[PDB]
Design a protein around this ligand. Structure first.
Ligand SMILES: [Pt+4]
Ligand SMILES: [Pt+4]
Ligand SMILES: [Pt+4]
Length: 129
């Protein structure tokens, strides 16, 4: 499913991401825009053989099992395919584990490079939440 900006903001807010570990909603919506262009079905292969999955491009080296990343850790305890669903619950619950890991939202390279220190509130501007 390809989310609208405000539709996704509302879903993330309902799932408890607004201010989770101090990150306002706009940060999460910005990360999703640049990671996956709001498409829950996005996949991208990494040079090391791992793959990133879904709206927040969560990586199979650490976070999920895809049956093809030898030595992967499955920290969210979930098949990676679960992260591609139109229901963002699995992605959101896994993202909460990731952002609590010690590096905050720096775990998402597009967030570091494209959202961090920008006016992220613009991403929720005009939305009914
Ligand atoms: Pt939902
Ligand atoms: Pt594996
Ligand atoms: Pt709402």
């Amino acid at each position: 499913k390809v989310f609208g900006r405000c539709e996704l903001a509302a879903a993330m807010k309902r799932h408890g991401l607004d201010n989770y570990r101090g990150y306002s909603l706009g940060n999460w919506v910005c990360a999703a825009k640049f990671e996956s262009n709001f498409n829950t079905q996005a996949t991208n292969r990494n040079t090391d053989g791992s793959t990133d999955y879904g709206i927040l491009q969560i990586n199979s080296r650490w976070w999920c099992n895809d049956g093809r990343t030898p030595g992967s850790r499955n920290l969210c305890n979930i098949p990676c395919s679960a992260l591609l669903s139109s229901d963002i619950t699995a992605s959101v619950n896994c993202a909460k584990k990731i952002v609590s890991d010690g590096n905050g939202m720096n775990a998402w390279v597009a967030w570091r490079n494209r959202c961090k220190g920008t006016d992220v509130q613009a991403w929720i501007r005009g939305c009914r939440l």
